[PDB]
Swiss-Prot record:
Protein name: Methionine aminopeptidase 2
Enzyme Commission identifier(s): 3.4.11.18
Domain of life: Bacteria
Cofactor binding description: Binds 2 divalent metal cations per subunit. Has a high-affinity and a low affinity metal-binding site. The true nature of the physiological cofactor is under debate. The enzyme is active with cobalt, zinc, manganese or divalent iron ions. Most likely, methionine aminopeptidases function as mononuclear Fe(2+)-metalloproteases under physiological conditions, and the catalytically relevant metal-binding site has been assigned to the histidine-containing high-affinity site.
Length: 282
């Protein structure tokens, strides 16, 4: 399998006009980055519903992952699942992004665009899906293997999953946010991988990326302490090779410079009075 290149984009999929759009749809930038980090009880309830629906759309599009299938076909399946549930696909028209999820194969770190690219035997495919319903977002991603994936590349996926699940388990009120990046990068570095630095987790509520940043590497200077009612993502991109990367002419797709493969998982988390709740479950 060699250096991916861009296929061709289908036209914008339509969203029935009854489904409420986030404010940024069709605008160049989003109104976000200065929202409260602690959600009201009502916003948290509504986020369990966004969360379950984006977890539905991810499993559904993930079941279609197979040698043969286009990434456009995954986007179609994700788009249709969100729409049939009354959810707007958060990515659609978000800063001009063209599709309803991001599909990121192999040396694509993140933000790959659904197109006519055909998944081949041995590929790894990340599907990243966000839902917007009742005023709030649910955000979640997983890397799926397609056919006979190399051991090297299976170990990578399962170890990225494992990093994310370790990170999540250490989420509790009163503990420092920098504990997440420490657990992740220590797990990663244990097997010689390299955690991506420029791309982060985020606060999420009534907005997509609300200004709260969640580093996936070890950075103790961050003073932020986790509080009950905090809602944020853990979404680590773990690289087999060098951290260096490039961006396609489409201005979205991020690829590793050395073309070595990379994997990611993501969940949307609630900090509770004593623990953690994962909102992006079925
Ligand atoms: Co995401
Ligand atoms: Co996210
Ligand atoms: K990838």
């Amino acid at each position: 399998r060699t250096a991916l290149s861009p296929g061709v984009l289908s036209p914008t999929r339509p969203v029935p006009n009854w489904i409420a759009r986030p404010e940024y749809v069709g605008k160049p930038a989003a109104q976000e980055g200065s929202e409260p980090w602690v959600q009201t009880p009502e916003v948290i309830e509504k986020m369990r519903v966004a969360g379950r629906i984006a977890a539905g759309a991810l499993a559904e599009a993930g079941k279609a992952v197979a040698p043969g299938v286009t990434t456009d076909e995954l986007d179609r399946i994700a788009h249709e699942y969100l729409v049939d549930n009354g959810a707007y696909p958060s990515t659609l028209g978000y800063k001009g992004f063209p599709k309803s999820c991001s599909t990121s194969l192999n040396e694509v770190i993140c933000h790959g665009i659904p197109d006519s690219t055909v998944i081949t035997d041995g590929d790894i495919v990340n599907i990243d899906v966000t839902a917007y319903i009742g005023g709030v977002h649910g955000d979640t991603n997983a890397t799926f293997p397609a056919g006979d994936v190399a051991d090297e590349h299976r170990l990578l996926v399962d170890r990225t999953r494992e990093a994310t699940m370790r990170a999540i388990n250490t989420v509790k009120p009163g503990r420092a946010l920098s504990v997440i990046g420490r657990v992740i990068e220590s797990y990663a570095n244990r097997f010689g991988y390299n955690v991506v630095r420029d791309f982060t987790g985020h606060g999420i509520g009534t907005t997509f990326h609300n200004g709260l940043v969640v580093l996936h590497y070890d950075q103790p200077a961050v003073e932020t302490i986790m509080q009950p009612g905090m809602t944020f993502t853990i979404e680590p991109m773990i690289n087999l090779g060098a951290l260096d990367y490039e961006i396609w002419d489409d201005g979205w797709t991020v690829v590793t410079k050395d073309r070595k493969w990379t994997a990611q998982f993501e969940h949307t988390l609630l900090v509770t009075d004593t623990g953690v709740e994962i909102l992006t479950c079925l």
